[PDB]
């Protein structure tokens, strides 16, 4: 059981963003929701840091707060809400790739971790670091 997991949630849009923090809830693909609802019991926590598709830049990260709900929404669709679940917002501020052009993911071919996937998950050791380097932030 790993305790702390990490992934990066890939954002089409700031506006979508925007949401995420205003309203504290995020959605994703079928294939990342697997992955997450098991980590989500897995691990203590699962941190998502966010990035807008080409953007330069990660816009904050947050914490899974709960789990992504189906079966009802199973033969329904996307509809009502389907998929949203709840994250809690750590850290808001935009973060330039640059600053983490030292960070490689092992679990990603030791490329650069501004370089994921959606739903890609860090290994936890550069995860850790992906998430310290907000302290220099204000």
Same mark, same amino acid.
Do not use: C, M, T
């Given at each position: 059981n790993m305790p702390v997991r990490y992934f990066i949630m890939k954002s /089409?849009?700031?506006? !979508? =963003?925007?949401? /995420?923090?205003q309203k504290g809830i995020w959605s994703t693909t079928p294939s990342n929701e697997r992955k997450l609802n098991r980590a989500f019991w897995e691990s203590s926590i699962v941190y998502l840091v966010f990035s807008v598709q080409g953007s330069g830049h990660f816009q904050g990260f947050s914490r899974m707060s709960s789990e992504i709900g189906r079966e009802k929404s199973?033969?329904?669709? /996307?509809?009502?809400?389907?998929?949203?679940?709840?994250?809690?917002?750590?850290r808001k501020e935009s973060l330039p790739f640059q600053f983490a052009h030292?960070? =490689? !993911? *092992?679990? !990603?071919?030791?490329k650069k971790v501004q370089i994921s996937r959606d739903?890609?998950? =860090?290994? *936890?050791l550069v995860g850790e670091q992906l998430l310290q380097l907000w302290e220099r932030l204000p």
């Open positions: /089409s849009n700031l506006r !979508n =963003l925007e949401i /995420s923090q199973q033969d329904w669709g /996307s509809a009502g809400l389907g998929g949203v679940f709840k994250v809690e917002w750590i030292h960070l =490689l !993911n *092992p679990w !990603n071919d030791n739903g890609q998950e =860090l290994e *936890p």
